[PDB]
């Protein structure tokens, strides 16, 4: 809970993956720093004009695998592409993204390693491989890229949509305040003796967006930029 | 706060 | 910011290419010296005839990779070819360049790596192999070429095309002033603990544009060589 | 002081 | 600039050879002892009576590899054929030589490892392969065969072609004196501890042909063997 | 230096 404010803030593809790719001790998530994108996403029955920005990454659990001998092996497991299995069934309204909000990535300096095809469409599995050698038992984790969002005017139709949202009256309209996942092309092999406990969807939209963002005040652990509106290099 | 383009439809 | 005057500058490929592709030490950029070159640029709605110098080479980051036992392996991994992903994004208008600009490079002793068309074009992605031995965690650059440009008459229609750009008001004349970027067929795999942090495309365009250059004296850290418009050697 | 061909179409 | 007196001279390809490619102690360049030949070389709009001779050789840079582990492995790179990337930039009118030429070469006791035709047509990548273990960087160097040419009465029509040219009044007549480089089938691949730095051709060119040539003399560093014209066994 | 060569 009130470990969220103990997690750091990092930017870039190389402070994140630096900070949680480490196999000796690997960690369960930070804040990201990033920029704010403005433009189309289907929620329900139509488009809405949504703010995205990132704001935390974090490892997801894969696999425990177990070698009880000093054998090298290749190891074969299952990782996925595009929204995490999570998101996809929090979610009951049509949801679909365009594969032009990945600006939001370039310009956050962010590579999920994938295709903008891939990376913002239905979770899809994959397999890869590793060169192992044993005795012993290794944790995998995949990391997760978590995004905010406000879908404008969506908070009437769509509130219930989602099992984590926060609706603001802007006047005569409605915004919708919600959290999204993406897997990247990214995974750790930690051995089980220093395996850390993984963040669940559950936990991370609790902390991130019901605990640390209030949509009045647009601020808490993070704040929208809401000058992408006028931007067209931050619009898709 | 926050401009946009979007309306109920 | 002030750290890219404590940057040093570099002639030819065997100077950069050495300085930067260090796996020890890795350095995150250097200046370059080079040959000013005249000829079309497409922008916007048509060509300009642009006066482009190289500026910059810089280590762009690509990948982290973490091999966690004694395990001899083969990675892949993925790099681009052309234009940057950054450079890209963060132009609006219409780009184009003819692959006949890369006398610019022949003259400054520089060599991509790449054909005279994969050179200049969109950003392509393709796979690269590195035989591998862990334990370790390691993480991958690719070098980026930054040029300087005066698209001559530009400024008036393109001034707001570029995220980071300078007009310059010649008579009747507005001149626009940006920076490209470029990859080469080049990369370093260093260890984590040696890892330098990289720039980014924003830092690069903010401290060498728009800090040390002044278009109104053409000085500053660099400046151009407008012989070029008469010598058939640096014509395209 | 650049010299020019380009005409702004 | 007057290290050029202090390069020694070498005659034949046992001499050049051992001299330049010695991987301990790479050497930047050396004078050639050649034979001088006649017959035509095309420039511009029409073919020229030629008198050719060699004059230097230098390792020309080809890429830095970067191997972090001790790890053998397979490395590719690409190597060029015919004449030089920079020389073929440093020509603007039409410019073609017959593969007979190649005479020079048999005449200086000098092989270039490619076909007569190979060896005098334009500039062709190819690659090449070496096994290589680490850790290390390496500098990888080709050989490349300066030549010195009197192209009579080219003078007056192609004074402007070549960046670097001579220009000698006989009579009513005015001879053109320029240089010309092709690659040979050699490399060495240096550790960059010992790699040196490599010549390039505004150096090559500047020191051997304009610093050290004197057309009204016909003397300087070397002269050329007129006798080349009386001789069956030295025309093409 | 000896010479066939012309201007055409
Ligand atoms: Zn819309
Ligand atoms: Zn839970
Ligand atoms: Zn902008
Ligand atoms: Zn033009
Ligand atoms: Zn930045
Ligand atoms: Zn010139
Ligand atoms: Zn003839
Ligand atoms: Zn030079
Ligand atoms: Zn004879």
Same mark, same amino acid.
């Given at each position: 809970?009130?470990?969220?404010?103990?997690?750091?803030?990092?930017?870039?593809?190389?402070?994140?993956?630096?900070?949680?790719?480490?196999?000796?001790?690997?960690?369960?998530?930070?804040?990201?720093?990033?920029?704010?994108?403005?433009?189309?996403?289907?929620?329900?029955?139509?488009?809405?004009?949504?703010?995205?920005?990132?704001?935390?990454?974090? %490892?997801? !659990?894969?696999?425990? =695998?177990?070698?009880?001998?000093? +054998?090298?092996?290749?190891? @074969?497991?299952?990782? #996925?592409?595009?929204?995490?299995?999570?998101?996809?069934?929090?979610?009951?309204?049509?949801?679909?993204?365009?594969?032009?909000?990945?600006?939001?990535?370039?310009?956050?300096?962010?590579?999920?390693?994938?295709?903008?095809?891939?990376?913002?469409?239905?979770?899809?599995?994959?397999?890869?491989?590793?060169?192992?050698?044993?005795?012993?038992?290794?944790?995998?984790?995949?990391?997760?890229?978590?995004?905010?969002?406000?879908?404008?005017?969506?908070?009437?139709?769509?509130?219930?949509?989602?099992?984590?949202?926060?609706?603001?009256?802007?006047?005569?309209?409605?915004? %919708?305040? !919600?959290?999204?996942? =993406?897997?990247?092309?990214?995974? +750790?092999?930690?051995?089980? @003796?220093?395996?850390? #406990?993984?963040?669940?969807?559950?936990?991370?939209?609790?902390?991130?967006?019901?605990?640390?963002?209030?949509?009045?005040?647009?601020?808490?652990?993070?704040?929208?930029?809401?000058?992408?509106?006028?931007?067209?290099?931050?619009?898709? | 706060?926050?401009?946009?383009?979007?309306?109920?439809?």
């Amino acid at each position: 809970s009130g470990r969220f404010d103990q997690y750091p803030t990092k930017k870039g593809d190389f402070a994140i993956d630096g900070y949680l790719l480490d196999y000796s001790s690997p960690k369960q998530g930070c804040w990201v720093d990033g920029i704010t994108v403005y433009g189309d996403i289907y929620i329900g029955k139509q488009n809405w004009g949504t703010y995205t920005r990132p704001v935390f990454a974090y %490892l997801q !659990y894969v696999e425990t =695998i177990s070698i009880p001998q000093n +054998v090298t092996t290749t190891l @074969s497991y299952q990782l #996925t592409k595009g929204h995490t299995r999570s998101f996809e069934t929090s979610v009951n309204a049509k949801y679909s993204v365009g594969a032009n909000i990945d600006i939001v990535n370039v310009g956050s300096e962010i590579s999920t390693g994938f295709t903008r095809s891939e990376s913002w469409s239905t979770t899809q599995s994959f397999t890869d491989t590793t060169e192992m050698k044993g005795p012993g038992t290794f944790v995998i984790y995949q990391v997760v890229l978590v995004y905010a969002h406000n879908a404008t005017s969506a908070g009437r139709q769509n509130a219930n949509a989602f099992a984590y949202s926060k609706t603001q009256a802007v006047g005569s309209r409605v915004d %919708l305040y !919600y959290l999204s996942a =993406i897997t990247q092309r990214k995974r +750790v092999i930690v051995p089980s @003796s220093n395996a850390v #406990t993984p963040l669940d969807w559950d936990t991370v939209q609790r902390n991130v967006l019901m605990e640390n963002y209030n949509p009045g005040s647009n601020s808490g652990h993070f704040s929208f930029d809401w000058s992408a509106y006028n931007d067209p290099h931050r619009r898709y | 706060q926050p401009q946009s383009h979007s309306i109920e439809l």
